[PDB]
């Protein structure tokens, strides 16, 4: 789906498969957290469906030794003094010592600051200990989380449910057409991005020779030149787009192992899964009620959330005994305008926007040799058009797709291409559309606050700020205190402080609330990107103090108060709202549940010969299924005729469906539902087993 999804896919610890315990066989104890996973397998991250606990993810620092056990690095404290040498321990070796956590106060020598340290002893035991019994200590306060979990600012502020949906959801974000990195993020994203392999790095050090859209040419100091390609609009496995963009300017000095191109989702060599948006937290006239989301039209006009989705369809020319099929331009009984897009080859030319139902590849099977029908001999005789030895099986555009034809590709027997056994040419075609966001697409923040967009207001209706900036997204209040995850509010406050920049009062001295604040943080320039790691970020007092020093606006005024609440004007009414609303920035991502994929309707269609029910599938606009609890609903209503209609003419009886379709097109009453054709078959089968079934009328005589 993006870089983070792939990197996470490769670090996976799966419990299922060939040679392991079954899914139904694994007890409920195998599936929960165990006090020895600490620092090896992430307790937070897991799938949410029926494979919960059965797929974990390898922790950040953990690494696997030869035999096959997972080890985590510690540092060793010989006698209350912390070393710089680190030992990788397994789960059974660690059970034999006493391990203290990375928050223990340390001197500059490595001397323990207090008398008693908190430590983990044996299995699932926590206790204070005098400073002599301390053997080891953790590498980093975020040693116990995964790579996807590691990128959730203020993760120790959420609960495990919303943290889980947050980690889980980040690996389903669609890469946009533009990327920006988040104004508030973890130290994790430069590292994650460079590792997951979709940025192009520089192998040696040198000077940029020439920059293209297609390639970068580097000049080594050695004298030899290395040229890197950048694949442009590749259809990645999950239908999203992959694009590489040379990030460096021409004639520059590049270090060895430096980023040079920006893959999908990466900005400046950084894991960027969304955009920064100006959010205000309140209910707004029930358009965001029940976890939906109000979007500002500015996003759709500026292309802030546009994506590129690239499809592919494939059809081929395989031999049948009646003859060898072929892909060719002319097609019986299709006007010239419809066939204008295809060329002489039979394939659509590159860049012709295709509405559904259109032809992409024109192929004809040699029609099975039957006799030419006499009624058809007169019908075709009056005009003089022969139904040739060929029927028409041309590749067509499924409904609900559009876009351009960016590239076609063909395999032949003459080219010497490897082909499957019995097919002569295979043809694929790529169609790429550009989706703008709208109703019914899923959005999500980073703390597992999903949502569908239920409305898009026009720019001049959004509650706007005292200086006339309209907010972009309006996230309701009622889902913050119920989920029990307030990391999003802190992410918003900090985010606003990153937007405006700030300058602490350092002339009089340093105020107390910023004593432990780093020196580079005393004073930020507008739109400065901060980082707050996991389990070691901005504290409360430090945040609150940062909200008093926000730089005043280009008009002169200061827009949010000491609380983080601002005064908003109502776009429709034009009055000010009667209280201050909480505005600020947030990092929002566009998930992969789009309304164009997940919409199917079907009045009639193609059925299946044997089950005689409508043929399933989202790709053949199959009909949607009507299970058993919907029947119990029907019967609790007393709706006899609706349920008898669903169960008979809408699925099984062929006679019924033909009669109903015909009566509807003709404009007469639909026939009143009688006895299914299925009944007579039940009786023919009971009559097969030498049972004898008769039907009794009121009087008692058979029928």
């Amino acid at each position: 789906n993006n870089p983070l999804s792939g990197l996470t896919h490769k670090r996976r610890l799966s419990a299922l498969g060939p040679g392991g315990l079954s899914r139904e066989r694994a007890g409920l104890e195998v599936r929960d957290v165990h006090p020895s996973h600490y620092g090896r397998m992430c307790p937070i991250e897991t799938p949410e469906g029926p494979n919960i606990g059965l797929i974990g993810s390898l922790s950040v620092y953990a690494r696997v030794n030869p035999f096959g056990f997972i080890e985590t690095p510690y540092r060793k404290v010989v006698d209350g003094v912390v070393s710089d040498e680190i030992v990788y321990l397994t789960a059974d070796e660690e059970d034999r010592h006493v391990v203290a956590q990375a928050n223990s106060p340390i001197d500059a020598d490595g001397r323990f600051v207090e008398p008693r340290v908190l430590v983990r002893r044996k299995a699932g035991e926590v206790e204070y200990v005098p400073s002599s019994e301390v053997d080891y200590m953790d590498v980093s306060p975020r040693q116990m989380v995964s790579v996807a979990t590691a990128m959730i600012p203020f993760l120790e502020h959420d609960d495990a449910n919303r943290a889980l949906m947050g980690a889980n959801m980040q690996r389903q974000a669609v890469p946009l057409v533009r990327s920006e990195a988040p104004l508030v993020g973890t130290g994790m994203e430069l590292r994650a991005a460079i590792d997951a392999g979709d940025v192009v790095v520089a192998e040696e050090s040198g000077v940029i020779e020439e920059v293209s859209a297609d390639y970068i040419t580097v000049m080594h100091d050695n004298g030899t030149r290395r040229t890197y390609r950048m694949r442009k609009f590749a259809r990645s496995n999950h239908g999203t787009c992959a694009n590489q963009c040379p990030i460096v300017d021409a004639g520059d000095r590049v270090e060895a192992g430096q980023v040079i191109a920006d893959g999908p989702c990466t900005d400046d060599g950084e894991m960027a899964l969304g955009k920064n948006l100006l959010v205000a937290i309140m209910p707004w006239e029930g358009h965001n009620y029940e976890d939906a989301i109000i979007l500002s039209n500015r996003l759709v006009e500026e292309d802030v959330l546009t994506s590129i989705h690239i499809e592919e369809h494939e059809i081929d020319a395989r031999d049948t005994k009646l003859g060898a099929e072929e892909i060719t331009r002319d097609i019986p009984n299709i006007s010239d305008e419809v066939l204008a897009d295809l060329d002489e080859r039979g394939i659509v030319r590159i860049g012709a926007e295709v509405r559904d139902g259109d032809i992409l590849v024109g192929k004809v099977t040699p029609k099975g040799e039957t006799e030419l029908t006499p009624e058809e001999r007169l019908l075709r005789a009056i005009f003089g058009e022969k139904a040739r030895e060929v029927r028409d099986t041309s590749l067509k555009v499924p409904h609900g797709e559009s876009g351009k034809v960016i590239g076609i590709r063909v395999f032949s027997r003459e080219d010497e291409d490897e082909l499957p056994a019995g097919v002569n040419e295979l043809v694929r075609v790529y169609v790429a559309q550009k989706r703008k966001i709208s109703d019914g697409d899923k959005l999500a923040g980073r703390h597992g606050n999903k949502g569908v967009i239920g409305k898009i207001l026009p720019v001049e209706d959004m509650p706007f700020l005292a200086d006339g900036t309209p907010v972009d997204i309006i996230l309701n209040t009622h889902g913050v205190p119920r989920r029990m995850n307030i990391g999003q509010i802190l992410e918003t406050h900090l985010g606003w402080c990153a937007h405006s920049g700030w300058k602490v009062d350092a002339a009089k001295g340093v105020p107390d609330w910023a004593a432990r604040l780093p020196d580079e943080l005393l004073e930020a320039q507008p739109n400065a990107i901060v980082s707050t790691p996991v389990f070691d970020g901005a504290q409360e007092a430090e945040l609150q103090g940062l909200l008093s020093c926000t730089l005043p606006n280009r008009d002169g005024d200061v827009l949010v108060d000491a609380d983080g609440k601002a005064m908003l004007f109502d776009g429709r009414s034009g009055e000010p709202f009667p209280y201050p609303v909480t505005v600020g920035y947030m990092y929002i991502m566009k998930l992969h549940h789009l309304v164009d994929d997940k919409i199917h309707a079907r009045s009639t269609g193609p059925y299946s010969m044997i089950t005689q029910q409508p043929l399933g599938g989202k790709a053949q606009f199959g009909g949607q299924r009507f299970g058993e609890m919907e029947c119990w609903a029907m019967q609790a209503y007393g709706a006899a005729y609706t349920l008898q209609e669903l169960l008979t003419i809408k699925s099984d009886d062929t006679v019924g469906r033909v009669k109903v379709y015909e009566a509807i097109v003709k404009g007469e009453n639909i026939p009143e539902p009688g006895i299914p054709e299925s009944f007579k078959v039940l009786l023919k089968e009971l009559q097969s087993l030498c049972l004898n079934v008769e039907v009794l009328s009121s009087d008692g005589a058979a029928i």
Binding site: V60, Y61, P73, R75, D84, I86, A102, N103, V139, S140, P141, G185, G187, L190, R191, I194, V254, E255, A256, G257, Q258, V259, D268, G269, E270, R516, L517, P518, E520, L521, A524, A528, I529, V530, S531, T532, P533, D536, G537, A538, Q539, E542
Partner: peptide, 23 residues
């Protein structure tokens, strides 16, 4: 520059503890 990576754009950090080993 505390960051190992050659030309990485820098984020001020609310880091209270120095990390002994790099990831």
């Amino acid at each position: 520059s505390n960051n190992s990576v050659p030309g990485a754009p820098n984020r001020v950090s609310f880091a209270k503890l120095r990390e002994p080993l790099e990831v």
